[PDB]
């Protein structure tokens, strides 16, 4: 039908090996921040059969038990037995952590007033908001996340005890073009792949994924007789987690953000303290975009910012409103400049980014949930 | 000025530790493909002080010397001495490689006709093309890549012998909005950070980066008295490569593609054979987008595709032409459907994706150079 298009987003579960690495990286960041709010943390995690490796740079006054922090994160995810392919009790935890490069430290934060700390790196970051949901997120990515959360819920409450922690979901929505905004019409296609035990048959799993997962998450008004279902499309997913697929921190950056909507500057979030603008500026850009939509200045908006290592102020700010504002992009840019200070040493104060809440961000997306500070819109003066 | 906006893209050099990992992952893929064109390769690389770790899944008839392949890639990059922070001769090479999950193999390619092989994973992928350059790439990302290539050239030819392999660049362009297309006006800001020896002073480096790098790359017509230069903005970059910052495969996915323009589905390219649609479908989507622009059907276009693991045909195809076509997005989608077969087992034939040319893709972006098969536009019938 004219003026309609498809858009697909994916999400992954807590036991997806890339997401394990994000959660462990952020468990390590939180452990540091609990003791040293000014910890400099750049913690990469690598997961493969029987192995968590931490690699990166931490300068911190904290005394952190990496064995305890890593194993507790893997326990939470649900990898607690060799039968599941991974066990927090018996896996290898390897550590290749060194202090932050003194050359970076001197260029970024040494002898700097906190408000005037340099960006911890160069880079570009985007924030996006869309009025298509109350939480100002694309429906595709919201539904994809909720399908993984539902799998974890039914695993944890024992109603589908054949479930394992590693899962992926994908949602295709047919959208109507509406004066620069997008109106969801229907769910065109759903994919669910989830790791499972060696007892449950494929028909039992496919029936349960439709009746107990999809129907429990996706409103019936979006599902019809044409909706395509790819449930356990590989046919067998017993081998999973790190054993099935090597995981790395920062390899789910589109799952972490807008499910392909908006834009992405390439930076990973997990394992990084606020001085790493890959995270703090992306959080602030989401906060700006959500403030513009919730302030009624536009229905859909994209914010780009960029930084140079050692420089506080963003090098560039850009606003793209998809034609969904009576105000020009120039007028929105002036409103953003009058209302926001996107220096990392000010963002840290506004969004409370020394607080050890980061592990809670590292699954089901960083945006659109739990009224994190970047999800509470700023009242705009103009 | 009205109808203008800023856009920023970044690039990194061959010695950037994330890019080292991409190049090593693709050196391993090429080594396998040279002996076994049907090698199943999912090779992640991790780099930190003194360490290359390979982690992932390879099923191959090839006999590959991982020590030789890794060290030769690091030699090519230029890390050949402890004075530079990393040495191919004396670094640790660790291998945590296992066969591909039999559960994946059976669901994707076992006993399948090559044309009908399943996608190696679910996911979404985008292709983008823009008429703003002959190679149909954004000027921001082209200039950012060329600045890193120029640093490597002047390092390798000995004219700036204080240069080390680790570099990052960032280019902000002021654009004019032109009937849905974008017209570059001027370069607003350039960042260059490059690793250097302990002899050269900051003023010598900043003078050389302006006169011998920027002026050798960026046309003077884009530079004016207002252009902002952030050259060695950290003030000191002696510690670099993996010693300065842990690197991972697939952590430069926006550098690898469009520098934040278009869109990204989240998939990494390097270390993956053609059955991994993260790479093959992103290459095919670029080929489609470039074919539409070079065919004169639009000035700027974005193509989304998506897949389910074990399913050959894409689940969804979407065309966004930014209002730069007389044809509707529906009419362009029909043209794409009539001219392209985006099954991975057909893409492999069209783009010759068993050929060991992947290491050549793993720096300076996968798109817009060297007339790779995905850069040669398909003549469209309609
Ligand atoms: C860059 C990517 C993430 N991105 N950003 C917007 C879109 C759209 C989109 O918004 N289309 C559209 C076109 C005309 C219209 N008039 N009113 C409303 C409206 C909407 C579509 C796609 C498909 C996936 C390629 N990607 C988009
Ligand atoms: C989703 C991101 C990568 N993305 N994709 C397009 C844009 C534009 C853009 O094309 N703007 C514009 C607006 C109106 C116009 N009329 N004619 C031409 C034209 C152009 C701008 C930004 C800034 C960085 C936020 N991002 C974009
Ligand atoms: C398909 S694997 C990626 C390709 C893999 N590295 C290989 O060697 O072919 C990517 C993700 O899909 C999921 N996965 C793993 N095994 C699977 C299977 N048998 N069926 C479906 N999805 C699976 C896991 O979430 C895993 O992290
Ligand atoms: C700034 S480092 C990332 C943050 C780092 N992990 C930390 O511990 O703070 C990111 C990239 O910037 C570059 N880099 C490293 N040291 C640098 C320095 N002293 N000055 C400028 N850029 C540097 C390298 O390309 C490196 O991979
Ligand atoms: Cl959720
Ligand atoms: Cl180049
Ligand atoms: Na992997
Ligand atoms: Na790193």
PDB file of C-alpha atoms and ligand atoms in Angstrom, chain A residues 125-128 260-264 301-305 317-323 329, chain B residues 3 5-8 128 175-183 258-263 300 302 320 322 324, ligand 2:
ATOM      1  CA  UNK A 125      27.448  10.323  18.722  1.00  0.00           C
ATOM      2  CA  UNK A 126      23.753  10.493  17.867  1.00  0.00           C
ATOM      3  CA  UNK A 127      20.594  10.808  19.934  1.00  0.00           C
ATOM      4  CA  UNK A 128      17.173   9.864  18.538  1.00  0.00           C
ATOM      5  CA  UNK A 260      18.945   0.775  13.319  1.00  0.00           C
ATOM      6  CA  UNK A 261      16.666   3.846  13.526  1.00  0.00           C
ATOM      7  CA  UNK A 262      18.221   7.295  14.059  1.00  0.00           C
ATOM      8  CA  UNK A 263      21.993   6.941  13.548  1.00  0.00           C
ATOM      9  CA  UNK A 264      25.117   5.656  15.324  1.00  0.00           C
ATOM     10  CA  UNK A 301      14.450  14.085  15.871  1.00  0.00           C
ATOM     11  CA  UNK A 302      18.091  13.110  15.441  1.00  0.00           C
ATOM     12  CA  UNK A 303      20.913  14.960  17.272  1.00  0.00           C
ATOM     13  CA  UNK A 304      24.568  14.582  16.181  1.00  0.00           C
ATOM     14  CA  UNK A 305      27.445  15.757  18.408  1.00  0.00           C
ATOM     15  CA  UNK A 317      26.016  19.872  16.992  1.00  0.00           C
ATOM     16  CA  UNK A 318      23.406  19.019  14.305  1.00  0.00           C
ATOM     17  CA  UNK A 319      19.588  18.606  14.501  1.00  0.00           C
ATOM     18  CA  UNK A 320      17.573  16.662  11.872  1.00  0.00           C
ATOM     19  CA  UNK A 321      13.776  16.817  12.590  1.00  0.00           C
ATOM     20  CA  UNK A 322      12.567  14.730   9.533  1.00  0.00           C
ATOM     21  CA  UNK A 323      10.196  17.660   8.691  1.00  0.00           C
ATOM     22  CA  UNK A 329      16.482  22.836  12.349  1.00  0.00           C
TER      23      UNK A 329
ATOM     24  CA  UNK B   3      19.441  25.211   4.720  1.00  0.00           C
ATOM     25  CA  UNK B   5      23.996  21.790   8.637  1.00  0.00           C
ATOM     26  CA  UNK B   6      27.177  20.186   9.996  1.00  0.00           C
ATOM     27  CA  UNK B   7      27.964  16.471   9.761  1.00  0.00           C
ATOM     28  CA  UNK B   8      31.019  14.796  11.316  1.00  0.00           C
ATOM     29  CA  UNK B 128      23.893   3.657   1.238  1.00  0.00           C
ATOM     30  CA  UNK B 175      26.505  20.865   3.899  1.00  0.00           C
ATOM     31  CA  UNK B 176      23.778  22.607   1.853  1.00  0.00           C
ATOM     32  CA  UNK B 177      20.359  20.838   1.739  1.00  0.00           C
ATOM     33  CA  UNK B 178      19.649  20.382  -2.046  1.00  0.00           C
ATOM     34  CA  UNK B 179      16.210  18.849  -2.949  1.00  0.00           C
ATOM     35  CA  UNK B 180      16.828  15.790  -0.676  1.00  0.00           C
ATOM     36  CA  UNK B 181      20.527  15.512  -1.765  1.00  0.00           C
ATOM     37  CA  UNK B 182      23.451  17.099   0.144  1.00  0.00           C
ATOM     38  CA  UNK B 183      26.015  19.536  -1.318  1.00  0.00           C
ATOM     39  CA  UNK B 258      29.503   5.459   5.797  1.00  0.00           C
ATOM     40  CA  UNK B 259      30.989   7.469   8.713  1.00  0.00           C
ATOM     41  CA  UNK B 260      27.533   7.710  10.365  1.00  0.00           C
ATOM     42  CA  UNK B 261      25.634   8.527   7.141  1.00  0.00           C
ATOM     43  CA  UNK B 262      23.016   6.067   5.840  1.00  0.00           C
ATOM     44  CA  UNK B 263      22.369   3.512   8.608  1.00  0.00           C
ATOM     45  CA  UNK B 300      20.905   9.491  -2.415  1.00  0.00           C
ATOM     46  CA  UNK B 302      19.340   3.794   1.709  1.00  0.00           C
ATOM     47  CA  UNK B 320      14.497   5.232   1.404  1.00  0.00           C
ATOM     48  CA  UNK B 322      15.400  10.981   0.781  1.00  0.00           C
ATOM     49  CA  UNK B 324      15.752  12.349  -4.545  1.00  0.00           C
TER      50      UNK B 324
HETATM   51  C1  LIG C   2      20.169   9.423   9.749  1.00  0.00           C
HETATM   52  C2  LIG C   2      21.383  10.338   9.537  1.00  0.00           C
HETATM   53  C3  LIG C   2      22.648   9.590   9.168  1.00  0.00           C
HETATM   54  N1  LIG C   2      21.031  11.337   8.537  1.00  0.00           N
HETATM   55  N2  LIG C   2      20.485  11.075   7.304  1.00  0.00           N
HETATM   56  C4  LIG C   2      20.243  12.198   6.687  1.00  0.00           C
HETATM   57  C5  LIG C   2      20.649  13.267   7.523  1.00  0.00           C
HETATM   58  C6  LIG C   2      20.646  14.671   7.413  1.00  0.00           C
HETATM   59  C7  LIG C   2      20.062  15.267   6.196  1.00  0.00           C
HETATM   60  O1  LIG C   2      20.115  14.645   5.139  1.00  0.00           O
HETATM   61  N3  LIG C   2      19.433  16.468   6.320  1.00  0.00           N
HETATM   62  C8  LIG C   2      18.726  17.090   5.279  1.00  0.00           C
HETATM   63  C9  LIG C   2      17.519  17.707   5.683  1.00  0.00           C
HETATM   64  C10 LIG C   2      16.688  18.308   4.786  1.00  0.00           C
HETATM   65  C11 LIG C   2      17.027  18.307   3.439  1.00  0.00           C
HETATM   66  N4  LIG C   2      16.422  18.808   2.322  1.00  0.00           N
HETATM   67  N5  LIG C   2      17.212  18.513   1.214  1.00  0.00           N
HETATM   68  C12 LIG C   2      18.275  17.865   1.584  1.00  0.00           C
HETATM   69  C13 LIG C   2      18.232  17.685   3.017  1.00  0.00           C
HETATM   70  C14 LIG C   2      19.087  17.069   3.944  1.00  0.00           C
HETATM   71  C15 LIG C   2      21.113  15.409   8.504  1.00  0.00           C
HETATM   72  C16 LIG C   2      21.623  14.727   9.616  1.00  0.00           C
HETATM   73  C17 LIG C   2      22.150  15.543  10.752  1.00  0.00           C
HETATM   74  C18 LIG C   2      23.286  14.966  11.579  1.00  0.00           C
HETATM   75  C19 LIG C   2      21.898  15.114  12.184  1.00  0.00           C
HETATM   76  N6  LIG C   2      21.614  13.407   9.703  1.00  0.00           N
HETATM   77  C20 LIG C   2      21.145  12.678   8.703  1.00  0.00           C
END
